[PDB]
Amino acid sequence: FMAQILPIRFQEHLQLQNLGINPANIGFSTLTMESDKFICIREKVGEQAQVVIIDMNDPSNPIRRPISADSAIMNPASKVIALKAGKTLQIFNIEMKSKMKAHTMTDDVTFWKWISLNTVALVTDNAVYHWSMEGESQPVKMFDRHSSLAGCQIINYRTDAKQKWLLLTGISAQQNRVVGAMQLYSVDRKVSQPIEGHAASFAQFKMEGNAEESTLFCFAVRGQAGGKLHIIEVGTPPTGNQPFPKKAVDVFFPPEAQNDFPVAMQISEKHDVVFLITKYGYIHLYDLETGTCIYMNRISGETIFVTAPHEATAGIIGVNRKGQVLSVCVEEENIIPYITNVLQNPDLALRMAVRNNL
Numbered sequence: 001f002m003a004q005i006l007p008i009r010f011q012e013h014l015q016l017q018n019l020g021i022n023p024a025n026i027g028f029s030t031l032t033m034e035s036d037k038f039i040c041i042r043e044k045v046g047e048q049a050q051v052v053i054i055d056m057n058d059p060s061n062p063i064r065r066p067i068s069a070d071s072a073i074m075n076p077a078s079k080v081i082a083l084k085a086g087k088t089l090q091i092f093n094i095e096m097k098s099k100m101k102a103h104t105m106t107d108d109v110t111f112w113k114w115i116s117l118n119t120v121a122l123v124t125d126n127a128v129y130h131w132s133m134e135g136e137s138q139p140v141k142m143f144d145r146h147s148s149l150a151g152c153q154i155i156n157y158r159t160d161a162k163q164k165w166l167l168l169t170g171i172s173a174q175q176n177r178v179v180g181a182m183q184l185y186s187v188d189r190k191v192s193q194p195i196e197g198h199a200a201s202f203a204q205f206k207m208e209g210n211a212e213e214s215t216l217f218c219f220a221v222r223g224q225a226g227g228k229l230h231i232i233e234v235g236t237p238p239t240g241n242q243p244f245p246k247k248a249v250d251v252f253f254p255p256e257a258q259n260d261f262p263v264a265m266q267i268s269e270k271h272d273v274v275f276l277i278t279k280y281g282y283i284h285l286y287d288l289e290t291g292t293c294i295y296m297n298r299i300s301g302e303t304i305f306v307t308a309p310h311e312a313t314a315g316i317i318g319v320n321r322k323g324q325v326l327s328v329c330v331e332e333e334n335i336i337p338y339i340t341n342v343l344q345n346p347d348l349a350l351r352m353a354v355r356n357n358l
């Protein structure tokens, strides 16, 4: 019944192979998408190393520049790029065709990522630094890496809005299993907590009855105990707030997907919904407040290896290994009809409408 309406809208935005991108470079090590504004691909044509920048507001005319770097990450908001070659890092102002700042590390940077409009996070074998793109400041060590991540492939680093809660995520192969290892660091308490988790995000959420927002930490994992999603308040609640009750729910995998697991998460600020993407290309939607599973479906035939918030829709945008750039967001006119008549959850239908953010 009502099978024709979904609580989501799926969109295809681009096919990178139609823009002259070699499929061999559509992957984690060579393609970055730090926000929904740009995609950056490192390619080698002949023996000329090149960087291709796709402006998502003008994607038919990508810029191909012969530059040699081990990694390239566009700023989330500005026409600014960070480039790395060996231990040397440089940030460039593209519009002004000028170098902004540079720094030479002592230890190799194995993973890096913009965490804000002006700060890039650097991960070495044993520590995590934050580096502002402004002024003269060098990178600042934020914390030392926990031993539980030793030997992991680092796959993500992200923070809460106030950059007081920092999360490093790695994976490792244990026999034929992919095991997630996370390090949650409190800047104020100077304490680390190891967590078995595969994908995660932070969110700000205003509880009914509270005047101030709660800082939530959501992570998903598939371990020996199966698929689980947790939603937790981190830190001391703002003065006057009631604490957010911890939520824990199952993450479902069908019998033919015993080897699937979570790989990406983004949270809608507007709709208080968690988007979870699995290795096999499934998307799940969960209510942030309760963890209720709203929707699941396989939306990609190829693995989606990078995601970002999709600002205009408060959704999630991602690139899959074939070069499809795709997004999922809440369908604002159909989600409450779906919850009412397919999920048959009038509590959630009511709570959603009361939030009145559709």
Ligand SMILES: O=[N+]([O-])c1ccc(NS(=O)(=O)c2ccc(Br)s2)cc1
Residues within 6 Å of the ligand: 065, 066, 067, 068, 069, 081, 083, 084, 085, 088, 089, 090, 092, 093, 094
């Ligand atoms: O902003 N750019 O697109 C842009 C900025 C600087 C250059 N110079 S470079 O020698 O190729 C260079 C490569 C790696 C580092 Br690290 S510096 C080229 C392009």
